[PDB]
Design a protein around this ligand. Structure first.
Ligand SMILES: CC(C)(COP(=O)(O)OP(=O)(O)OC[C@H]1O[C@@H](n2cnc3c(N)ncnc32)[C@H](O)[C@@H]1OP(=O)(O)O)[C@@H](O)C(=O)NCCC(=O)NCCNC(=O)Cc1cc(O)cc(O)c1
Lengths: 417, 146
C-alpha cells in the first residue's frame, strides 16, 4: 500500500513548515512557494489515499455503515481517527480566528474527504441518509412546538396556522443574509414542519425589514453574508455543505424517520409540499432555494439572480428549469431575471402586484393538501433529480467549492463589499 | 417672457438652476433634470413654470440639438442617492387647494407638453420661418424609479 505513510510524511512537513515560517502576510515569495508546494504534495496524497481507502475509512468511523453520523460529526471523528487526513477541531479554530486572506485552507482537506465519501456508492448514500435524519435541536423543540404552534429563533420565526408551517426569515437588519446560524435555524424549522402532524403544507417568506432603505418592506433573501465570508465566518462543512445536504434536501425528500410508525415500509421519509413567496428579490442562496419548491410566488417588483463561488446546487438544477443557454447566462454571466419578464415563468408560477400578493399566497396554501400531491411530488422529484445525480454533483461540489472558497480572486472580491 | 429674459445668460453660461428644474447645455444636449429631491418630483404650479421656461430655452438656444428629460438624485430617506423621474401631481397641494385649473392643468397641456410636440412659435425673425414658423427639436426621456 504505502499511501498512509507518505501522507503522514507530507502532513508532518506541512506542520513543520507552519511552525517555523512567519505568519501569512510576512512571508517572502520564496517562503510562500515552499508552503504552497507542501500543501500541494499533502492534498494530492489525501486524494490518492481516499481513492482506494475511502470505504475502509468510512466503515471505521460508522461501524460499517451501522451508525448514521452527520457531517460535523463525520469530519471531526475522521480527524481523531485519521490524524492529518482532515484538520482537527483545534486546527479549525485557529483558521476561524483569521480572515480568509490569511488562512491556510485546511477546509480544502475536508473538501477532499467529503468528495471521496460521496463518490462511494456505499458510503455516499449512507451519509445523505444521515443528513436527512431529524436534527437533535428539532427533536428537542418538537413537543413545545406541537403545543404552542410557535418557535422564535434568531434568523427564522416558525408558526403553525391553518395546517401551514409558516417560516418567516426575519433578519430585519441585513436583508436575510445567510450565515451558519441561519442554516441551524432553517434546518430546525424544516424538521419541525415535517415532523408536526398538524402541519400539511409549508410556506417560506421573508419578514419585514428594519434597515432604513427597506423599513416596512419584506425581502426574501440577499444571499450569503459576504462580510462573514470575507472575515472567515462561512464554514465549508457547517454552512456550504450543511445547507445542501440538510434543509434544502429535506424540502425535496422529507425527513428520514425511524421505523416507528405504520407506512414506514413504503414511506421511510415524511415529506410535505412547500410554497415560497419572494418579496423584494431572491439573490444567491435565496434564489437557489426556489429550484426546490412545489409552488413559487413573487411580487411584481422582484428579481432573481445568482452573483466568485459556485451557487450551491444551482448548477445542478437550473438547467432543468431553464435549459443550458439561460442557465449559463444567469450563472456564468450574472444575468438577472425580473418577475414580470416572460422567462421568469421558468422560475415563478405567479407574479402578483404587492397589494394582491398576500391573498394570492393564501390561496396557494389550500391547493396542495392531498395525499395525491404527496405521491405526485415524490414521483416528480424522483424523475427530475435522481439519487445518483444529486450525489455525483455534491461529491464534486465538496472539492470545487472548497477550492473556490480559498481562491485569491474570491478572497479579494468578497473583501470589497 | 421668463425664458426670453433668461436666454442671453443661458447662451453664455449653458446652465440655469431653478426650483424644480436644473437646465444644462452639454455636448449639444439640453439636459433638463427634475430636481425636487424631497418629494420625488411631485408636480405643482411652480414645476410647470420651470418646465415651460426650460423647454423654451432649449428650443430657442441654437447650440442645443437634442433635449433630455430625466429625474435627479433624491434626498428623501427612502430614496436617498437614487434618481426618481416623477411621482405625479402634488396630492397634498391638490387637497389644500393649491393646484390651479388654468395655471397648472391647462397651462402644462397647452404649453411645454405641446411644445415638446410642435415646438415654439417665434416671430418672423429668421430665415426659413416661411416653412418653419416653429423651432422644434427631438426629445429623449429616461425614467428612473417610476
Ligand atoms: C441587496 C442589494 C441588491 C440592495 O442594494 P442596497 O439596498 O443599496 O444595499 P445595502 O445597503 O448593502 O443593503 C441593505 C443592508 O443589508 C445588508 N446586507 C445585504 N446582504 C448582505 C450580505 N450578504 N452580507 C452582509 N450584509 C448584507 C447591507 O450590508 C446593508 O446593511 P449596512 O451594512 O447596515 O448598510 C445589495 O445590498 C447587494 O448587492 N447585496 C449583495 C448581494 C450578494 O452578493 N449576495 C450573495 C451572493 N452570493 C451567494 O449568496 C453565494 C452562495 C450562497 C449560498 O448560500 C451557498 C453558496 O454555495 C453560494
Amino acid at each position: 500500500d504505502g499511501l498512509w505513510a507518505a501522507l503522514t510524511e507530507a502532513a508532518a512537513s506541512v506542520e513543520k513548515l507552519l511552525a517555523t515560517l512567519p505568519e501569512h502576510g510576512a512571508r517572502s515569495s520564496a517562503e510562500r512557494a515552499e508552503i504552497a508546494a507542501a500543501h500541494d504534495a499533502a492534498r494530492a496524497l489525501r486524494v490518492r489515499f481516499l481513492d482506494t481507502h475511502a470505504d475502509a475509512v468510512y466503515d471505521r468511523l460508522t461501524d460499517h455503515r451501522r451508525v448514521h453520523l452527520r457531517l460535523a460529526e463525520l469530519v471531526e471523528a475522521a480527524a481523531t481517527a485519521f490524524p492529518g487526513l482532515v484538520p482537527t477541531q483545534q486546527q479549525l479554530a485557529v483558521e476561524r480566528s483569521l480572515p480568509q486572506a490569511a488562512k491556510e485552507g485546511h477546509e480544502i482537506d475536508q473538501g477532499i474527504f467529503l468528495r471521496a465519501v460521496l463518490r462511494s456508492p456505499l458510503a455516499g448514500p449512507h451519509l445523505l441518509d444521515a443528513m436527512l435524519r431529524p436534527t437533535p435541536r428539532a427533536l428537542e423543540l418538537l413537543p413545545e412546538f406541537v403545543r404552542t404552534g410557535e418557535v422564535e429563533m434568531e434568523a427564522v420565526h416558525l408558526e403553525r396556522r391553518d395546517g401551514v408551517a409558516r417560516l418567516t426569515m426575519c433578519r430585519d437588519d441585513r436583508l436575510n443574509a445567510e450565515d451558519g446560524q441561519q442554516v441551524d435555524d432553517m434546518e430546525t424549522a424544516v424538521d419541525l414542519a415535517l415532523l408536526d402532524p398538524g402541519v400539511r403544507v409549508g410556506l417560506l417568506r421573508g419578514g419585514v425589514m428594519s434597515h432604513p432603505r427597506y423599513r416596512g418592506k419584506r425581502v426574501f433573501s440577499a444571499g450569503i453574508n459576504l462580510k462573514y465570508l470575507s472575515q472567515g465566518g462561512i464554514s465549508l462543512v457547517d454552512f456550504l455543505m450543511r445547507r445542501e445536504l440538510g434543509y434544502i434536501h429535506k424540502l425535496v425528500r422529507g425527513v428520514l424517520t425511524n421505523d416507528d410508525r405504520p407506512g414506514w415500509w413504503h414511506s421511510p421519509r415524511i415529506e410535505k409540499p412547500w410554497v415560497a413567496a419572494v418579496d423584494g428579490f431572491a439573490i444567491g442562496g435565496g434564489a437557489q432555494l426556489l429550484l426546490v419548491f412545489d409552488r413559487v410566488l413573487a411580487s411584481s417588483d422582484a428579481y432573481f439572480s445568482l452573483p466568485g463561488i459556485i451557487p450551491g446546487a444551482a448548477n445542478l438544477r437550473l438547467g432543468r428549469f431553464a435549459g443550458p443557454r439561460v442557465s449559463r447566462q444567469v450563472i456564468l454571466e450574472g444575468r438577472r431575471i425580473w418577475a414580470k419578464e416572460p422567462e421568469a415563468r421558468l422560475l415563478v408560477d405567479e407574479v402578483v402586484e404587492p397589494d394582491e400578493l398576500d391573498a394570492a399566497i393564501e390561496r396557494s396554501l389550500t391547493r396542495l393538501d392531498g395525499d395525491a400531491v404527496l405521491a405526485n411530488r415524490r414521483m416528480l422529484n424522483l424523475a427530475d433529480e435522481s439519487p445518483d445525480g444529486f450525489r455525483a454533483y455534491m461529491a464534486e461540489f465538496a472539492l470545487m467549492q472548497a477550492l473556490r472558497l480559498y481562491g485569491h480572486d474570491t478572497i479579494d472580491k468578497v473583501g470589497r463589499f
